[PDB]
Amino acid sequence: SEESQAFQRQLTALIGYDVTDVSNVHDDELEFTRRGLVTPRMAEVASRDPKLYAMHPWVTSKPLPEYLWKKIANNCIFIVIHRSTTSQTIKVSPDDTPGAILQSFFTKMEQDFVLRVCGRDEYLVGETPIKNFQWVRHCLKNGEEIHVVLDTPPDPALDEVRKEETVSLWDCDRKFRVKIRGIDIPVLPRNLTVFVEANIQHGQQVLCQRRTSPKPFTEEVLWNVWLEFSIKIKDLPKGALLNLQIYCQLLYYVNLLLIDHRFLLRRGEYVLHMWQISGFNADKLTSATNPDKENSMSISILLDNYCHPIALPKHQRAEMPNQLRKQLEAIIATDPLNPLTAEDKELLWHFRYESLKHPKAYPKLFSSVKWGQQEIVAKTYQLLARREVWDQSALDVGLTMQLLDCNFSDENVRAIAVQKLESLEDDDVLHYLLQLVQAVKFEPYHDSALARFLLKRGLRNKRIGHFLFWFLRSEIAQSRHYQQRFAVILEAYLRGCGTAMLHDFTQQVQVIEMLQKVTLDIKSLSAEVSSQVISQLKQKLENLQNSQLPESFRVPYDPGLKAGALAIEKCKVMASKKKPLWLEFKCADPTALSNETIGIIFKHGDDLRQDMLILQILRIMESIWETESLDLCLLPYGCISTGDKIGMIEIVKDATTIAKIQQSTVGNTGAFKDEVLNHWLKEKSPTEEKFQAAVERFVYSCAGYCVATFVLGIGDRHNDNIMITETGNLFHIDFGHIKERVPFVLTPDFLFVMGTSGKKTSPHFQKFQDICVKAYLALRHHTNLLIILFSMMLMTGMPELTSKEDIEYIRDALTVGKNEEDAKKYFLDQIEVCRDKGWTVQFNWFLH
Ligand SMILES: COc1ccc(-c2cccc(S(=O)(=O)N3CCN(c4nccnc4-c4ccc(OC)cc4)CC3)c2)cc1
């Protein structure tokens, strides 16, 4: 039809990639995944409650934090309910249902009304106590009033979805072989000899290696040689990768899955365009080929074809000594970055039913399996069929994440990690979502349980689905390595989210494309900002607003908010290397009880996915702290990669950098004075109440950021990259932008404000040291979780292209090993290194 061809053409523009494109493909896998995902998508669309889908309430089952409780004086919460123009402040209990709060409204003077948060497409509905709604919790934390507009449900017809579209391998004792025909590149000019190393890999584990003779590095090098491996064909596991690498030293690589998605041994002829190494990475593991056929290195190979095909079948007492049990338990209580030795692995494997009794043992036990041995692998599966302990176990997200990393390539190992994730409520899925999307890079096949968990969760909740879109779209628009997989996963989502989200995504995508042009132009007018730039900006925004540009769009980093018209007078270009656009918008919603403006920074030039990852991890730290009743007042500002080297960032209101506070100079030229931050703080606070409230928030936020940045290894920052709000909330910005050194930014200007300038102690600095220690020890209760996120982040987001060594930073900084008091002391040390010390690093940067 056309019809369907129009839709597909719609889809393509949203995704920013053509899933029907069959040009950079050498098999069926992608098309096969497209059709495979029809079922899971249709089962979730059909099974969806349409009423709750449309109103997407955002709730949690977590207790309301202690902190939080102390903001509810007499078991009471006030809710102001608007209707045209009148508004009454009902009195409510924290366990009252929105059902109960509507009866308590009509009786306190046609059932079809919901409470809608004023100024936002956010609903307080369903069978949840009002205190357990995240908006309600947001309000309680920030000391704001809870304003709701009594109105009519959203019509679920707007979310309507358009009706849609052998010889056994274990009988083969032959050793496996690949013919290397040759390599061909259109131009050399690196400025030698070369060989091809051929690896049989299973999830980063090298099973097997054969290599070619060196030959001179011409534009074309023929070999043309059989490389016979030590490994039999019957022992090739599912997920086995043929990895082909070109040396002198590593210059190019490419991969070919040896067992395909239909369980068939790969046969025949391939010409494969390779990826280049650029002067330890999820990129190294991709099954995708370079689409750039004009410029890339190519390798030509032949797989030992047999006119008969080869599948891959689908698998159908005693007691431990006391001291070996203790040997084992010591292994199991060791952290994720701790190397297993050959001995440890053998102990793990020999005593593998004992090991199964401990869910924490599983990464290390599955890391002790010989995946290059058909019979051992078979015994691993017999083991995983015996899973009562794993299934009864309390979800541990840290443990589960670990089974979904680069070390686990077996479908069946990974499927029990996803099994566990099913029990996460939507609030927790949102916390981990970007890390779960990224973990899709460690999957061998396009269609995986993980991909289907993400799809399912995205289709079941519009807030999840919103972030799944942008997170997937971000990767598609800058990862050639994975854009084909992620595009197929994104199209799948897109075919089940409903007509209204499709409409919304289009406008957002449209707004974003318009603003890209508008900032490309301004970057190039402005050399390394003049009248005739804020001429041509205010000009271009006008000639768009006003054009062309949508009447409203949803804010991608905060989908409950809708932006309307530009505030053209408030829009500047920031005085910065990359000329970011500071934009401000009118809020589309009339029921918005303020006049405040929606601020959005748009920047070309930098890859914003690193920031995303760090910001997401800090939010995890806050939920970790929340479990121990600590609020460190972070501001993990919104920030979304929207396409290639572009994206938007939340303007935090009433906020300046610390540099600007100092640069009302001060006599440059140079450095720096201790009061000023405090005077600015007094200058911005009216009452002595608010001032001291501000000094307090400062003590918490400073502590949060000192801990959070130290653990992540990104605390040695210059103060043009540290901001503070008028109410005292300190925050770091711009994690892109990742001797003498410093573990964090605690400069004399922060110390004054705490009242310990020049150099002694004070009540506030005493609180600071105490809060830092509690915070630090709380994160350490979750050492494993943090070690896995950090190591995943580096591998999926941090070029570099990183080395077991960069990853080990965090265990050092988390002082793995140590006890509560040696760790308390370590961090109290770090607080002292900053004090010594003072302004040198800030001054030093001046030095240029
Ligand atoms: C207003 O609240 C903010 C929220 C987030 C951010 C932000 C977060 C991450 C990155 C960016 S950026 O790349 O657009 N940024 C880079 C650093 N940057 C500066 N560099 C040197 C000196 N000053 C700045 C700067 C100026 C103003 C400012 O906000 C008022 C923030 C930083 C400005 C623009 C900005 C800035 C302000």
Element containing residue 99 per DSSP (H, E): helix 98-106
Assess whether 447 and 537 both reside in one domain: no
- Whole-angstrom distance, CA of residue 623 vs CA of residue 610: 20
Identify whether 382 is part of a domain.
yes
Report strand pairing: 268-273 vs 581-587: unpaired
Q: What is the CATH number of the domain that holds 130?
A: 3.10.20.90
Amino acid at 284: K
Nearest CA to ligand 1 atom 23: 720
Q: How far is the CA of 658 from the centre of ligand 1 (A)?
A: 11
Identify whether 85 is part of a domain.
yes
- Technique behind the model: X-ray
Kindly state the DSSP code that residue 180 receives in the 8-state scheme: E
Calculate ∠ Cα 397-400-401, nearest 5°.
85
Assess whether 733 and 775 both reside in one domain: yes
Assess whether 546 and 688 both reside in one domain: no
Assess whether 77 and 5 both reside in one domain: yes
- Whole-angstrom distance, CA of residue 766 vs CA of residue 779: 21
Nearest-atom index, ligand 1, CA of 660: 23
Assess whether 279 and 381 both reside in one domain: no
- Whole-angstrom distance, CA of residue 714 vs CA of residue 732: 10
Nearest CA to ligand 1 atom 36: 651
- Tell me which of 572, 576, 725 to substitute to probe ligand 1's pocket, judged by most ligand atoms within 8 Å of the beta carbon: 576
Q: How far is the CA of 721 from the centre of ligand 1 (A)?
A: 7
- Tell me which of 529, 574, 582, 611 to substitute to probe ligand 1's pocket, judged by most ligand atoms within 8 Å of the beta carbon: 574
- Whole-angstrom distance, CA of residue 187 vs CA of residue 184: 9
- Whole-angstrom distance, CA of residue 470 vs CA of residue 641: 7
Q: How far is the CA of 145 from the centre of ligand 1 (A)?
A: 30
Choose the final residue of a domain: 291, 306, 321.
306
Q: Any residues with CB less than 8 A from the CB of 103 and at least 6 apart, and which? A: none
In angstroms, the first-to-last Cα distance of the chain is 64
Pure H helices in 439-498: 449-460, 462-476, 483-494
Q: How far is the CA of 733 from the centre of ligand 1 (A)?
A: 7
- Whole-angstrom distance, CA of residue 804 vs CA of residue 801: 10
Assess whether 253 and 229 both reside in one domain: yes
Please check whether residue 804 is in contact with residue 684, taking contact to mean a CB–CB distance below 8 angstroms: no
The residue with tokens 């410029």 is 295
User: In the chain, after which residues is the C-to-N distance over 2.5 Å, breaking the chain?
Assistant: 109, 165, 191, 248, 279, 316, 528, 738
Q: Any residues with CB less than 8 A from the CB of 40 and at least 6 apart, and which? A: 452, 455, 456
143: left (phi over 0), alpha (psi -120 to 50) or beta: left
Identify whether 548 is part of a domain.
yes
Assess whether 389 and 516 both reside in one domain: no
Assess whether 612 and 688 both reside in one domain: no
The DSSP line for 317-367 is -----HHHHHHHHHHHTS-TTSPPPHHHHHHHHHTHHHHTT-GGGHHHHHT
Nearest-atom index, ligand 1, CA of 577: 20
Identify whether 819 is part of a domain.
yes
Assess whether 481 and 340 both reside in one domain: yes
Assess whether 238 and 374 both reside in one domain: no
Q: How far is the CA of 676 from the centre of ligand 1 (A)?
A: 20
- Whole-angstrom distance, CA of residue 505 vs CA of residue 10: 11
277: left (phi over 0), alpha (psi -120 to 50) or beta: beta
Assess whether 259 and 331 both reside in one domain: no
Identify whether 71 is part of a domain.
yes
Q: What is the CATH number of the domain that holds 698?
A: 1.10.1070.11
Identify whether 848 is part of a domain.
no
Identify whether 160 is part of a domain.
yes
Nearest CA among 768, 742, 766, 753 for reference residue 834: 742
- Whole-angstrom distance, CA of residue 630 vs CA of residue 65: 9
How far are the Cα atoms of 282, 360, 366, 367, 811 from residue 405, in angstroms, in the given order? 9, 15, 12, 12, 18
Identify whether 722 is part of a domain.
yes
Please check whether residue 587 is in contact with residue 598, taking contact to mean a CB–CB distance below 8 angstroms: yes
Amino acid at 721: N
Q: What is the CATH number of the domain that holds 477?
A: 1.25.40.70
Domain count, the chain: 5
Assess whether 332 and 467 both reside in one domain: yes
Ligand 1 pocket list (CB less than 6 A): 574, 576, 580, 601, 603, 637, 649-652, 655-657, 659, 720, 733-734
User: Helix, strand or coil for residue 135?
Assistant: helix
Nearest CA to ligand 1 atom 21: 720
Choose the final residue of a domain: 165, 195, 224.
165
Choose the final residue of a domain: 498, 530, 553.
498
Q: How far is the CA of 723 from the centre of ligand 1 (A)?
A: 8
Q: Residue 199: give the domain boundaries.
A: 171-306
Amino acid at 13: A
Task: Resolution in Å, one decimal, please.
Answer: 2.1
Q: In the structure encoding, which two tokens stand for residue 585, read together?
A: 């918008």
Nearest-atom index, ligand 1, CA of 723: 31
Q: What is the CATH number of the domain that holds 188?
A: 2.60.40.150
